[PDB]
Design a protein around this ligand. Structure first.
Ligand code: NAG
Ligand code: NAG
Ligand code: NAG
Ligand code: CL
Ligand code: ZN
Lengths: 198, 595
């Protein structure tokens, strides 16, 4: 039978993804969990699963199917995983240690790169402390790197936290843009009203 | 927060912004070089000025750190490379004066043209015509007059400018807590803050003199042989026991003796190993040559080139509708963008040059994971050595016959081996004394050991003593022979061509041991040697994040420069010359002159 399948293409086939410092989160809680992600650019660069195996995923029920998305560099995809260190993992997007889900990443050079440089994607470079798991911080306050507060002005020892990317088609595979999306699954000890197809 | 955290944050921000801006500038410069147009010229110009202003303001902001409280050697080296004040230390007047002096020097050297008494309208400039004569002219008087007139025309006009440039650079470097500009140049090899691998600037001169002490015998015998062979081509002008004229070296300055092979050929009956005609018969092209170089490099164990390389790099001249500089160039635009600009033709020279450029690009990619301020070679000589070892290993007959260029029905013999070794010595070991004496003279001038009224006298005396090249005619002190060279008038260090020439053989002999070689060093091929490739990559990956001595230890196992591999390379040629250099007295008498 069929009730209504998941709008997974709405996040996998979006016209433009969101930045890392403001990564979006879409709650999928009332849809038939049809995991057929293969048709979205089957040649995935990184298709890894944490806490669940690849295909048995399609025949298991869950309460929340939260889906997070953002764009990062090709060499930064390794930071999107349980127990990782770096700029992204700590200051932009942190995954829990016992994360149960999947992480899909694919190249988006043609879409998110221009001959003149796509400076629309920003990322946090400085922060007072490391972010917690699944924490979101839009703060754009001047990071105090010196001793005085700087009164909230950009100057010496007072740098702006967010930095741009400037993706270009001539960049190397390591620096080309990579659209990444995470499929978070968690059981809240609640009745799973919806499940996947049989 | 201690100063270390502030330094780390500033260095990260600078890394990001400078990476972006340097990629922009390199892209503009590439667009200009690959297409000479006013629009691309303007793009290169504005990109360059913005990048330079960003670098200058960042260095100004970097000077706010004492650098003595920091302990991280990486941050220390990054700041040292970024905190160098440079020419801004002197007052603005001295800055403008030195900039004007440099500009006029470069323009006078480039726009220099010599009028001749043969015809009132028969002037020829340096690059074309004059070099053709100095290389292929067999007439004594013609090349003598040309060599004398070029100097009398350029050095006499540059001497008043050099008298200002020397003192200006001395007052500039001394203000930077240095002894002189010659010492400032030697700061590249300076290693401090790491016991066991440290290296002072003063040790460079001593080590170079020690290496030249061992280079001398082979060069003495080579010079004796070249002289004995030149007596037949230029009779009534050369001495049996005396030095050689300066206009019989094959070039305007005698830096390279490649043009003397046509006269000092040991066995001219058998032609040299040339695979030019063998390539056109197989319908070879730039793409095939570069793919063969790729297969050779990956066979050693190095990563294959980026996809953007084959897509963005221009490896063949599109014709005179997209005009570009035909010089072989390696372009590391940054952020994983690597390209090679070369008008690749179907010739063995183009094959070797493509191998060299591919090796340079491999080196550039090795340390790609290092900071922007450390994305460079260990020193000014390591890059060219790493690029030349590949061309050396590729030019061997075994490699040419393994890839299908040389016919299997041909076994090398001693005659062709001696010919190739001697032709290589004409440019490798034949130029070492020139570079050494030039650098020593420049150092002594910058230090002040040579008074202003003894420049040319000391220059010619050192030439006679070291290189064994006598002056053809009396030269007044208003002359300036050193300024006649490009690297001297354009304010470019020249010792790199010596230290690099030694590092070349140091690496060649260090990689042959890993490949389990069983013959002479000139027949070694690092192809299919995974251990040698990994040993080399373990050093190319470091780049500038570690001292150059430690990098040298990784490959060669020695902490300091060594010239024994250089002599081992030309050991068969040395024995052949010794066996042949007995018909006349070996050496030269500096007291004799052709006038
Ligand atoms: C110095 O800083 C760099 C970059 O933060 C770091 O990788 C290195 O381990 C530090 N070394 C020390 C603690 O001396
Ligand atoms: C590396 O070499 C292999 C074998 O030739 C090839 O399949 C692959 O596409 C190459 N990759 C790059 C980045 O050139
Ligand atoms: C390297 O290996 C290839 C393939 O086995 C072979 O064709 C080539 O002759 C070898 N080259 C040398 C000289 O080791
Ligand atoms: Cl000279
Ligand atoms: Zn080179």
């Amino acid at each position: 039978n069929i009730t209504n399948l998941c709008p997974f293409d709405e996040v996998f086939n979006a016209t433009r993804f969101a930045s890392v410092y403001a990564w979006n989160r879409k709650r999928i809680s009332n849809c038939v969990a049809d995991y057929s992600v293969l048709y979205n650019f089957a040649p995935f660069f990184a298709f890894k699963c944490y806490g669940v195996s690849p295909t048995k995923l399609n025949d298991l029920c869950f309460t929340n199917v939260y889906a997070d998305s953002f764009v990062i560099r090709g060499n930064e995809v390794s930071q999107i995983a349980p127990g990782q260190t770096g700029n992204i993992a700590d200051y932009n997007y942190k995954l829990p240690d016992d994360f149960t889900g999947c992480v899909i990443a694919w190249n988006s050079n043609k879409l998110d790169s221009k001959v003149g440089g796509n400076y629309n994607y920003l990322y946090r470079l400085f922060r007072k402390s490391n972010l917690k798991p699944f924490e979101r911080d839009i703060s754009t306050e001047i990071y105090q790197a010196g001793n005085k507060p700087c009164n909230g002005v950009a100057g010496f020892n007072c740098y702006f936290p967010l930095r741009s990317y400037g993706f270009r088609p001539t960049y190397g595979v390591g620096h080309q843009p990579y659209r990444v999306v995470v499929l978070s699954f968690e059981l809240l000890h609640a009745p799973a009203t919806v499940c996947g197809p049989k | 927060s201690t100063i270390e955290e502030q330094a780390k944050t500033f260095l990260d921000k600078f890394n990001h912004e400078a990476e972006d801006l340097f990629y922009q500038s390199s892209l503009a410069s590439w667009n200009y070089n690959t297409n000479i147009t006013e629009e691309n010229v303007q793009n290169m110009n504005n990109a360059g000025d913005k990048w330079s202003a960003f670098l200058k303001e960042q260095s100004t902001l970097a000077q706010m750190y004492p650098l003595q409280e920091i302990q991280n050697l990486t941050v220390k080296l990054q700041l040292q490379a970024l905190q160098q004040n440079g020419s801004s230390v002197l007052s603005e007047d001295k800055s403008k004066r030195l900039n004007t002096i440099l500009n006029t020097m470069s323009t006078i050297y480039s726009t220099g043209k010599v009028c001749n008494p043969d015809n009132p309208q028969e002037c020829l400039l340096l690059e074309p015509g004059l070099n053709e004569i100095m290389a292929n002219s067999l007439d004594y008087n013609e090349r003598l007059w040309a060599w004398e007139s070029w100097r009398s025309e350029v050095g006499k006009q540059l001497r008043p400018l050099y008298e200002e440039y020397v003192v200006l650079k001395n007052e500039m470097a001394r203000a930077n807590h240095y002894e002189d500009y010659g010492d400032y140049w030697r700061g590249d090899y300076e290693v401090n803050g790491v016991d066991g691998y440290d290296y002072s600037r003063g040790q460079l001169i001593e080590d170079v003199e020690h290496t030249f002490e061992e280079i001398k015998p082979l060069y003495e015998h080579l010079h004796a042989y070249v002289r004995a062979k030149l007596m037949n081509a230029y009779p009534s002008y050369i001495s049996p026991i005396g030095c050689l004229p300066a206009h019989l070296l094959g070039d305007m300055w005698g830096r390279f003796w490649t043009n003397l092979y046509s006269l000092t050929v040991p066995f001219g009956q058998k032609p040299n190993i040339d695979v030019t005609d063998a390539m056109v018969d197989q319908a070879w092209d730039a793409q095939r040559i570069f793919k063969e170089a790729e297969k050779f490099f990956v066979s050693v164990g190095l990563p294959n080139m980026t996809q953007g390389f084959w897509e963005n790099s221009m490896l063949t001249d599109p014709g005179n509708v997209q005009k570009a500089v035909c010089h072989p160039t390696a372009w590391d635009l940054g952020k994983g963008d690597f390209r090679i600009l070369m008008c690749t033709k179907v010739t063995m020279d183009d094959f070797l040059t493509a191998h060299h450029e591919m090796g340079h690009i491999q080196y550039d990619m090795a340390y790609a994971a290092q900071p922007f301020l450390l994305r460079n070679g260990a020193n000014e000589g390591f890059h060219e050595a790493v690029g030349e070892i590949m061309s050396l290993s590729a030019a061997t007959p075994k490699h040419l016959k393994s890839i299908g260029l040389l016919s299997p029905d041909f076994q090398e013999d001693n005659e062709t081996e001696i010919n190739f070794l001697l032709k290589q010595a004409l440019t490798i070991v034949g130029t070492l004394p020139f570079t050494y004496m030039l650098e020593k003279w420049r150092w002594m001038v910058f230090k002040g050991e040579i008074p202003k009224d003894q420049w040319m006298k000391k220059w010619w005396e050192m030439k006679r003593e070291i290189v064994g090249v006598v002056e053809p005619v009396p030269h007044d002190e208003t002359y300036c022979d050193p300024a006649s060279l490009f690297h001297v008038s354009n304010d470019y260090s020249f010792i790199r061509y010596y230290t690099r020439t030694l590092y070349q053989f140091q690496f060649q002999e260090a990689l042959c041991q890993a490949a389990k070689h069983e013959g002479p060093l000139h027949k070694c091929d690092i192809s299919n040697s995974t251990e040698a490739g990994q040993k080399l990559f373990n050093m190319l990956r470091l780049g500038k994040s570690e001292p150059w001595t430690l990098a040298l230890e990784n490959v060669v196992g020695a902490k300091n420069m060594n010239v024994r591999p250089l002599l081992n390379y030309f050991e068969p040629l040395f024995t052949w010359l010794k066996d042949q250099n007995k018909n006349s007295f070996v050496g030269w008498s500096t007291d004799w002159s052709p006038y």
